Amino acid sequence: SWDKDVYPEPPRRTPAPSPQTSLPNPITYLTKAFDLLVDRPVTLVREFIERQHAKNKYYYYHREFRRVPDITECHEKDVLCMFEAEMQWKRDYKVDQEIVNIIQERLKACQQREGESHRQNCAKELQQFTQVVKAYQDRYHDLGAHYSARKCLAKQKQRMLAERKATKEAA
Amino acid sequence: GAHLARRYLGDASVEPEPLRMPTFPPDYGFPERKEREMVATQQEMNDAQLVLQQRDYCAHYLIRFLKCKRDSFPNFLACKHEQHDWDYCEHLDYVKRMKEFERERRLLQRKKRREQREADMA
Amino acid sequence: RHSIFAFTHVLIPVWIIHYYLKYHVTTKPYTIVEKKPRIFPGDTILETGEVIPPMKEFPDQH
Amino acid sequence: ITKDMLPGPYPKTPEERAAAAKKYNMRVEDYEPYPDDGMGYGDYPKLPDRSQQERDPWYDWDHPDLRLNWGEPMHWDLDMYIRNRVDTSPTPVNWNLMCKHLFGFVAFMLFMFWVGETYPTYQPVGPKQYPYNNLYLERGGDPNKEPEPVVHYEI
Amino acid sequence: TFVAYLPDYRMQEWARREAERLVKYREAHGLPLMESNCFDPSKIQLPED
Amino acid sequence: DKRFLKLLRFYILLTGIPVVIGITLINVFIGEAELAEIPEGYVPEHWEYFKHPISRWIARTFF
Amino acid sequence: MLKYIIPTMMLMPLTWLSKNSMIWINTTLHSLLISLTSLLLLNQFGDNSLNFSLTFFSDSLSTPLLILTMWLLPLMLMASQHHLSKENLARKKLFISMLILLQLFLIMTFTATELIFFYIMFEATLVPTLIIITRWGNQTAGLYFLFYTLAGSLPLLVALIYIQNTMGSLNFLILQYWVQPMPNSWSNTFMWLACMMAFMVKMPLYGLHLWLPKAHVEAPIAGSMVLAAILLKLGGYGMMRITLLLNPITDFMAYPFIMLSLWGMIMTSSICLRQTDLKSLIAYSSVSHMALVIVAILIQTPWSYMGATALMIAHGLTSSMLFCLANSNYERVHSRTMILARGLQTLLPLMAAWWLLASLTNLALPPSINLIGELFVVMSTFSWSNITIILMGLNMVITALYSLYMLITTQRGKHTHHINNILPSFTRENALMSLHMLPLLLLSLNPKIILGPLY
Amino acid sequence: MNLFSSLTLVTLILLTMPIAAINFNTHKFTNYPLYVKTTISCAFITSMIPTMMFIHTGQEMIISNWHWLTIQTLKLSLSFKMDFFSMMFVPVALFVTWSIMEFSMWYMHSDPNINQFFKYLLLFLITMLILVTANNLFQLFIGWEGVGIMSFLLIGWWYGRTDANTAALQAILYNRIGDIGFILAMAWFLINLNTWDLQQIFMLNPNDSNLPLMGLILAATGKSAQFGLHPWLPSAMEGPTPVSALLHSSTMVVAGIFLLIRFYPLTENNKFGQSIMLCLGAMTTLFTAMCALTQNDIKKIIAFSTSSQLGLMMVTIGINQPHLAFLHICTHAFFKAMLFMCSGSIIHSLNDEQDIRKMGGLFKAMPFTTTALIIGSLALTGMPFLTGFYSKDLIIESANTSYTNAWALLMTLVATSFTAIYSTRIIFFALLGQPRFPTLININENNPFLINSIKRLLIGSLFAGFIISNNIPPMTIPQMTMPHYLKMTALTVTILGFILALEISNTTHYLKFNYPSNTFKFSNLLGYYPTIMHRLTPYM
Ligand SMILES: CCCCCCCCCCCCCCCCCC(=O)OC[C@H](COP(=O)([O-])OCC(O)COP(=O)([O-])OC[C@@H](COC(=O)CCCCCCCCCCCCCCCCC)OC(=O)CCCCCCCCCCCCCCCCC)OC(=O)CCCCCCCCCCCCCCCCC
Ligand SMILES: CCCCCCCCCCCCCCCCCC(=O)OC[C@H](COP(=O)([O-])OC[C@H](O)COP(=O)([O-])OC[C@H](COC(=O)CCCCCCCCCCCCCCCCC)OC(=O)CCCCCCCCCCCCCCCCC)OC(=O)CCCCCCCCCCCCCCCCC
Ligand SMILES: CCCCCCCCCCCCCCCCCC(=O)OC[C@H](COP(=O)([O-])OCC[N+](C)(C)C)OC(=O)CCCCCCCCCCCCCCCCC
Ligand SMILES: CCCCCCCCCCCCCCCCCC(=O)OC[C@H](COP(=O)([O-])OCC[N+](C)(C)C)OC(=O)CCCCCCCCCCCCCCCCC
Ligand SMILES: CCCCCCCCCCCCCCCCCC(=O)OC[C@H](COP(=O)(O)OCCN)OC(=O)CCCCCCCCCCCCCCCCC
Ligand SMILES: *C(=O)CCCCCCCCCCCCC
């Protein structure tokens, strides 16, 4: 299963079927036929296979990368430290890509799950999506195909000079 | 379809434009005109997933018709009276829109007569 | 071997696809996202148990 | 195959013209080459620029899909004048009248679409009026703010 | 069969799961989902003017 | 051409059917691992960072 | 990479010590073993390349090129053994040795960590290729070599020696971290052209492309396969390694050459609609497809590099299959005239099915990796400018047309009356078609291994 | 949840199973077309259960079942979208396809490549259900190019003929000119909205969406044979009659209309796209239905008929009424496939005769074909309470009663009259009059394949408009208050077309020889449009 905190969902409230007419619908009979003929054999096969899994339980792990010094506190043209900073920045870049992907998954799931009232009910997911895409665009856009930590730091310094001049001319 | 020729081949100063109207106050000619009363609650149609074209001042008959159309399955022809209620209320809303258009036409005729009497007097 | 077509082309694919959708696709987040069911005034929720209060008496027209 | 049957340079002397007409397997008086400007055609004949549709369709051809005979000098654009591609066949209506009718019909129809877009047709009704501040929260309005009240009246 | 079972080719799956950590870390502590700055602006000297 | 297609099906299935049945036996009997947190002081090997057993064998043996 | 170079060199005693009838079977078997071995190059990571030694390293750019290079040799041995069955046995072993030596040069051209070792291997690949084309080609100046080496290889040599003396190293791993911005000047402008024009000719670039529709026609089948499958991609690989150093001058110096490609893929594609030679049609199609690789490298966005490496791998596969189909017709009618033999689906249905699949992957039918590369290049060039899509889309009209016209001219219509030596398809030929097409179809099931260093 | 998505994917996997059957063979089949017909029957019955449990509630979902490719911000998953459009187009397409293949067991019975024919026809069905169940633009482009390539392969079915390959390559050229606009649309959505998934496109809600909608309109102009890019559909009658019946009437040619219906939340916020669609659709439904007035090849007449109906669909997308356009698709499929099937029965009975000037006397000679073709022509013209009444007339009721281009409305009404004109032209030259065909009458229609195949689409053409139109939920508000000259517009102009063309038909029995003027030579030569652009543009 997954975490309901990183993938939030509202509680699914279905209404109980109140048939106004007297005619028996084929949906409930096909549902019970699906539950007898299909659901129970698949479930028993999965129970046997899951027992066969649990007869040899063994675990894999999520690899943890400790923080190394970034490109800023690396000396210039010292490949032994800026290599580590570059691999740090590349792993963080790929993880930021997948964070933007998770927010896209939330936005699409909210839009489909709300249906027609999506423009009303998914303003929060749209706002979080706008925040994370604005952050990704300020962080990594227009670096080109030969992107590096140096190019990203140069973009961040140019952005900080523009923001500093904008704040200073305001005061 | 007389209004097309009355706006194109006659004069345009007295026929009301479709885009920017009503050009008059709501109570200009109406003493104690009541506001429209909404029947459907906003959350009741937020939970009814209605199209925003359909979230007008008469969507409560549409909510009743959709509850009928869901509940009367498979008998898909057992909801004619709810449909005719909703169509009759749409007909009354269309008649109210026609009354809006005719009110605008008669106020522009009123303005035409007013400016002609002002020109002939002064 | 008279209804072998309904067995080998329906029942075995329904088994395979329901197994794949239940234990590998729905176990993943947001893969089968179902639109929530339309709630009317007059519904009874199976999950919460609260009956939705109905609409106002109508300003009758006929 | 050898050298003196392949295409060579453009002919200058009339005996070279006669030897090339014997080379291209055709009459000398119907042998006419391309204009010598340097486009690289050589001694190749200017066939009369008719497609393979106007060739005899009932005739026993060597190549019945192309309607062509063995040894006959092919057109320079023989790949182009195939019956999958551009034709030279006559139409019962002239080319210039077809250009005039097609261009005039397209221009007159699109001009009448522009005129009708300038002059729309519509219904003798007002705008469709919507509750809850003309559907402010439904059209995506933020809940922290409050719009101006859009209140409609009975008529 | 070999290409089908490449052990997390160029660590995308990890990067999904690691993302599934970090968003979960920054829904709890109220931090925004992603900063506009990649590095800390305290550890950046700027060319003065 | 049909002899080529018979040979093509035979020589693909000749190791495809053992590979399909073997992956089926691994996924039924041996089976997919389960995600867990690292113990306090335990160092995993690199092939113990992968979920599928064939991927674990590939990362251990060759990579 | 030493675990691949040494079996490649052991293919030399494996091809000379073998028996008089065993030098195709042994070489094909053991080269397929090396091609199965080649999948260990897929030990790639999202941050770090697979760095073996000071001399050799293999990131996710060189890895699909290496797998395609080591896969191409058994396919060339299957292709070239029919028409060499009337050749002398020692010259047969000479041909196989030239192919093995060319593979040897290529597999350490793509894995050269250092740039002048890349240059020496890059200009060493031309010698077995020229021996193969001039000796086992069919028909009969030479000024193309001179014009190639004036505007190409030795300006690249002087340029790399200049980078060696300025930076201190031509290691690509060091030059990832010691790259300097290259400002606007005239010295840096001729520096940029000296670095780029050798690979520009090796792509080919439009206007510099006329060497290829003659070198494909004067080649045997193995020469055509190794030209259009790998040797044209040495230019793209060298450009993707050399545009690191050439920033930000490329941001205003890529403007001319992109024009030459964006119009060139319009022209050569249309030239493919007016061909009589089938092999020249495949050659001009190869030029029109490599034009998009030139564009995607010169605009240097990530989506463009992913599309360009996908298009390189997919085009190597597709063009090699088209040359092998043209070989299968040349070994029956003894003439490369496309309008000569027609209607061949009436005689060879499975070979016409392979023609259909090759023409579908030629016009980038989704979800093939041809369409994946084509589509990502079109996305990145739409990001470059919103007008180029027209020049893309018009191309994607014409790239359908000659893909199907070639399918309609040869394989459809009425069969030719005066040609009665059309044999049924041999098992070797359909095996060659299937070993070209089935990897190309299977890569549609998992394309992330052929999408370069920045997927 | 467990039933809906399961049977959704079971329909598609069941369609893919005979491809594995025809590819994993050694022996000669015990009637493989019967196997594919039984398979598509079963896929229709399988797809009817999610349709019923969508009629019950309105249960939409998405099956994003296989994560295929992640290009740094683009998660291309194998994503299926089961909404109203899939739930109402998939069983109609399966029912029409099952009828076409039981027709095809008889029409293509003397073919020694019947297995390849049914393989190609099932590949077309698989690609179209990729096209209409797609949730991202890449999978929709797969289905789009798939129906384009199967259009090539099924137009050039008799590949020895030069005109068949010519029409196939022509169809490819016009569809790739549409593909320019579709790849333009994909490029715009990736660069400006970072997505090909329809959910994020609908959620982000772009305002400056002129360029992607012009791309989609160019894609539909290529695919749905609108004006500028129409002539490949009159050329596309060169293939077999079940090809022109399945693909080029009901299944392939609606894909551009289906593309513009699928993008209705973007077209409903843009008046410029609505105006372009309205003008181009009125242009198409004028021009193609006018070119149908002067033809004698019956498949050309029904090809211009289905292109005129596609232009009417483009009109009712241009008036911001997408669900009425989609109901006109699902209505149009039944009787237009049946009209091509009855025309093919007339062709096969008269020894491959497609020219209506050598037909006649077939009122009692082919009575079941006569009955079914009269019912199809009436359901084409908008006879009251047949299936074509339940969408097409409603289109007119919303084409009059809206803020609309008036000239586009007037051309729509002229096209509505022209439909009745060529329908009674078909009935007069084909079923009415006297025999004009040769002397050895081998007229026969006594095969249970042919009877059952026309019979099921005839039950469809009698009942399916009523049944589908009463089973939908209301996604719009129907305009139901209008003046009596404006309610009775389409029926009156249709009857006027009937009567004026009965005058035109009764002119033919007069013994007077008239020289044809520029109107007959204009329309008979296809409005002069396939003459110039097929000679002048490839020359340059
Ligand atoms: C089949 C043989 C065919 C002939 C052989 C030759 C085949 C060709 C040669 C291939 C050679 C190898 C090539 C490389 C592939 C290797 C395998 C691989 O990578 O597989 C990938 C992938 C991953 O497999 P994996 O990595 O092993 O699984 C990882 C998990 O950890 C694993 O999870 P888990 O461990 O939890 O799962 C264990 C799983 C075992 O896992 C496997 O089997 C997977 C491994 C084998 C896969 C082989 C793939 C080969 C190619 C298949 C596809 C093409 C086939 C040909 C064409 C078909 C028609 C199109 O157990 C089961 O599945 C058992 C349940 C069976 C259900 C059915 C019966 C239930 C009711 C029974 C009632 C009776 C008894 C009741 C009482 C019992 C009491 C005790 O496998 C698949 O995708 C399997 C294929 C089927 C998937 C679902 C298909 C339906 C999807 C529908 C929607 C999408 C399509 C839409 C189309 C739209 C129209 C166009
Ligand atoms: C990793 C495990 C993978 C397992 C699954 C396998 C995945 C696919 C692999 C390739 C499958 C096709 C191979 C056979 C076709 C080529 C030879 C041929 O003509 O055979 C006909 C022959 C039967 O015909 P025949 O009457 O005997 O002789 C032919 C006639 O003379 C005259 O011939 P014809 O004209 O009547 O028939 C040719 C016909 C002509 O039809 C066409 O040309 C129309 C096709 C294009 C339009 C329709 C499709 C559009 C795209 C949608 C589909 C893809 C996405 C679907 C998913 C949903 C949406 C995303 O094409 C077909 O019937 C082929 C159907 C499959 C086509 C695949 C795509 C080709 C289109 C071009 C590229 C498209 C992009 C790449 C897509 C890749 C997808 C995996 O079939 C065989 O003998 C089959 C032998 C066994 C083949 C094994 C293939 C796998 C090899 C890999 C080995 C290692 C992995 C283990 C897997 C083993 C699986 C068994
Ligand atoms: C690589 C560069 C050089 C190019 C040339 C290389 C030549 C040498 C060849 C070496 C061997 C081959 C290498 C490439 C292998 C690619 C295949 C591969 O491994 O895939 C992995 C992919 C992996 O996909 P995945 O990413 O989902 O993997 C999941 C991860 N695991 C398995 C660990 C859980 O395998 C599959 O996708 C298999 C899926 C099942 C089989 C296919 C089912 C569908 C088939 C079609 C059904 C019908 C549909 C309708 C069609 C109708 C007709 C048109
Ligand atoms: C017909 C024979 C079938 C098998 C019969 C015998 C086996 C028993 C029956 C049950 C089936 C086997 C067990 C369940 C299946 C395995 C479950 C599992 O873990 O699957 C792992 C995975 C699930 O995906 P995933 O997300 O876990 O892994 C992908 C890997 N990453 C994330 C790194 C990208 O693979 C599959 O399930 C593959 C199924 C593919 C089905 C459709 C194939 C279509 C091919 C189209 C190619 C081109 C597409 C282009 C467009 C795409 C969209 C833009
Ligand atoms: C929303 C906006 C909508 C806008 C709509 C208007 C825009 C499009 C304008 C029209 C463009 C297409 C028409 C012009 C080219 C038509 C080519 C064609 O179809 O030729 C058909 C011809 C055979 O047909 P025919 O002779 O009729 O067959 C009878 C049987 N013997 O076949 C041949 O002769 C074969 C020819 C092969 C060589 C063709 C070389 C030219 C290729 C031209 C590609 C055009 C690319 C356009 C790019 C647009 C980018 C935006
Ligand atoms: C007022 O008359 C405007 C109505 C809308 C535009 C004119 C429509 C004319 C055609 C409809 C009536 C046709 C009756 C046979």
Curated annotation (Swiss-Prot), chain G:
Which reaction is the catalytic activity of this chain? a ubiquinone + NADH + 5 H(+)(in) = a ubiquinol + NAD(+) + 4 H(+)(out)
Q: What topology does the record note for this protein and the membrane?
A: Multi-pass membrane protein
Q: What is its EC number?
A: 7.1.1.2
Query: What Pfam families is this protein classified in?
Result: Oxidored_q5_N (PF01059), Proton_antipo_M (PF00361)
Keyword Ribonucleoprotein on this protein? no
Which cellular compartments is it found in?
Mitochondrion inner membrane
For biological process, the GO terms are: electron transport coupled proton transport; mitochondrial electron transport, NADH to ubiquinone; mitochondrial respiratory chain complex I assembly
- Report the principal subcellular site: mitochondrion
MF terms in GO: NADH dehydrogenase (ubiquinone) activity; ubiquinone binding
Q: Which InterPro entries match?
A: NADH4_N, NADH_Q_OxRdtase_chainM/4, NADH_UbQ_OxRdtase, ND/Mrp_TM
Gene Ontology annotations for the cellular component aspect, listed alphabetically: mitochondrial inner membrane; respiratory chain complex I
Query: Which keywords annotate this record?
Result: Electron transport, Membrane, Mitochondrion, Mitochondrion inner membrane, NAD, Respiratory chain, Translocase, Transmembrane, Transmembrane helix, Transport, Ubiquinone
- Subunit composition? Core subunit of respiratory chain NADH dehydrogenase (Complex I) which is composed of 45 different subunits.
> What does this chain do?
Core subunit of the mitochondrial membrane respiratory chain NADH dehydrogenase (Complex I) which catalyzes electron transfer from NADH through the respiratory chain, using ubiquinone as an electron acceptor. Essential for the catalytic activity and assembly of complex I.
Q: Which family does it belong to?
A: Belongs to the complex I subunit 4 family.
Its name, as the record gives it, is: NADH-ubiquinone oxidoreductase chain 4
**Biological source species:** Ovis aries
> What is this organism's lineage?
Eukaryota, Metazoa, Chordata, Craniata, Vertebrata
From Swiss-Prot, chain H:
Q: What is its EC number?
A: 7.1.1.2
Q: Name one GO biological process term.
A: mitochondrial electron transport, NADH to ubiquinone
Record carries keyword Cell division: no
Q: Where are the transmembrane segments?
A: 4-24, 43-63, 84-104, 114-134, 140-160, 171-191, 213-233, 241-261, 272-292, 301-320, 325-347, 366-386, 413-433, 457-477, 485-505
Major location (coarse): mitochondrion
Membrane topology category:
Multi-pass membrane protein
Q: Would you say which domain of life the source belongs to?
A: Eukaryota
Query: Broadest EC class?
Result: translocase
- InterPro entries reported for this sequence: NADH_DH_su5_C, NADHpl_OxRdtase_5_subgr, ND/Mrp_TM, NU5C-like, Proton_antipo_N
Q: Identify the keywords attached in UniProt to this record, alphabetized.
A: Electron transport, Membrane, Mitochondrion, Mitochondrion inner membrane, NAD, Respiratory chain, Translocase, Transmembrane, Transmembrane helix, Transport, Ubiquinone
User: Which Gene Ontology MF annotations are present?
Assistant: NADH dehydrogenase (ubiquinone) activity
Subunit and partners: Core subunit of respiratory chain NADH dehydrogenase (Complex I) which is composed of 45 different subunits.
Q: What is this protein called?
A: NADH-ubiquinone oxidoreductase chain 5
- Source species, please? Ovis aries
The protein's gene is named MT-ND5
